[model samples]
Target: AQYEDGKQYTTLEKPVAGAPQVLEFFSFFCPHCYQFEEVLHISDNVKKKLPEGVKMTKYHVNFMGGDLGKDLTQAWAVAMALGVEDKVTVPLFEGVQKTQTIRSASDIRDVFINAGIKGEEYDAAWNSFVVKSLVAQQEKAAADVQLRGVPAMFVNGKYQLNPQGMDTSNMDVFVQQYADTVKYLSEK
Candidate 1:
């Protein structure tokens, strides 16, 4: 009830991911995003509370790393196209946000390669039509949202759930509130 317009969330003009899905705009270069992944486990925990058939998707924004960030976004698209997102998402975050080992496209290529993607598959997926298309869409979405921060979530592409007011000291309650907010938005 408190998660109303101009309060917990704001409605968007154009919804992107259709109904029953959460679109997450994040970046590997963001330390908060890394913590959201490694420590908070936001996606994993929140998804569990979502209604069945409600899906979650991630779009790696290109605003963080300058030009190199676009390359990372491409790498993310490749991982998604190849269905190895589960395999390489953390590693990419680790390389960029943790270890600071991923400095170029080649480094990203190795992350995929080490994740068992063949060089040929990596190359194909890197330049594939689907991957390129998604990358373009991501960039456009980033610009459209005029994003101010990473790990932003849009429920059914319509509601942008605001996290600023949530209490972070008690993470368990915080996650539940976050998930409840998302669940509330998805059913709207």
Candidate 2:
């Protein structure tokens, strides 16, 4: 075997596009995803530790929040379009998991507003054809994976990292190990 199948990663039947890709599947409502950002700092640290030229993309799965799921997904797209993910990512997570405050599209808009994004630009991006396409693509990607859960990281669109096989006892250690695994997979 090229790598330890079912232990390190489960090979996908059909590889997704984007080589050397680190596609993170997550949901705002998922507590684990929140921990990944707020506690472990996976999103930021993984970017820092990942091998150069390897692209990391986030796919907000639209399976958790029901109708609100797709709404939050568009909010994420808007954040990315505005190049303000650094500002809104944590707040969105906090609103969903920690405070349990954000409920609808209006609530999500408030996050962007607080992040210094003007209401008009937020609305424009929220309704833009490009942002709409991004949201649709994310939803379709989630469906393509037939993903049953959040916080799954796919490397090179072929291997899904096995968290159970790694040491999650410490945040720093887990981030290092996780990125290292992703680095290995990117080269594979």
Candidate 3:
């Protein structure tokens, strides 16, 4: 019920199926996730310099349930459906953080519109079977992963980066380190 194959959201079951490596995880509501945006951008650039097959997939963690969670999940589902996940991801993250104004569905709609996604698309995505399934999937991931917090990173399904075990005060450094570790693992 939580996961609906490729419909609800894109899940790279095996990120490193045959080619390079992959980092597949993120969170929008977490302040740490917000701070890591710039770092992630840099990381993407770094990823580009690597061998061709290397790719990074971001999965927006939806741990916090409520109106905000619903809005964020809806926005993400829409972006994923439209193939604009990367374009809308940071904007949605920043919008949720900067605009204290975005607290409800309407507020989220405005943010989506500002990010170049049509309001109707967001509205439809919010109510879509895919989005609903994604919401449920996140809940299941939370329980299955036994996540204690946000921004959980899984690299090639071999290593997991959890903030709880690392230095919480300096998430940026930790994230970079985690990425580097993943890349190292991929090489081995």
lDDT against the true structure, each candidate: 0.84, 0.83, 0.58
Per-candidate total of colliding backbone pairs: 0, 0, 0
Clashing pairs in 1: none
For model 1 the TM-score comes to: 0.91
TM-score of each prediction: 0.91, 0.92, 0.68
Candidate with the larger lDDT of 1 and 3: 1
Q: Per-residue CA lDDT of candidate 3, range 1-188, in tens? A: 43232322223433433322454455667776776664445356437444557666555565564667856766676677678776766667766676666677677677668778777777777788987776665555444445566565545544454334444467556555555555554564
Candidate 2 local lDDT, 38-153, one digit each (tens)? 88888677688677776788878788989888898888888878889889988999998888889889999998999999999999999999998889888777776778988998
Give the residue spans of candidate 3 off by over 4 A. 1-23, 39-46, 49-51, 136-142, 162-176
Instruction: Tell me which of candidates 2 and 3 scores higher on lDDT.
Output: 2
Best by TM-score: 2
Quote the lDDT for 141 in model 2: 76
Q: Pick the candidate with the highest lDDT.
A: 1
Candidate 2, superposed: residue stretches over 4 Å from native:
1-3
Tell me how far the alpha carbon of residue 8 in candidate 2 is from the true structure, in angstroms, after superposition: 2.2
lDDT of 1 by residue, 1-188 (tens): 77777666788877655433688889999988888888888888779889888778788988789978989899888887889989998899999878889999999899989999999989988878999888987777777667778979888667898877688889788788888888888888
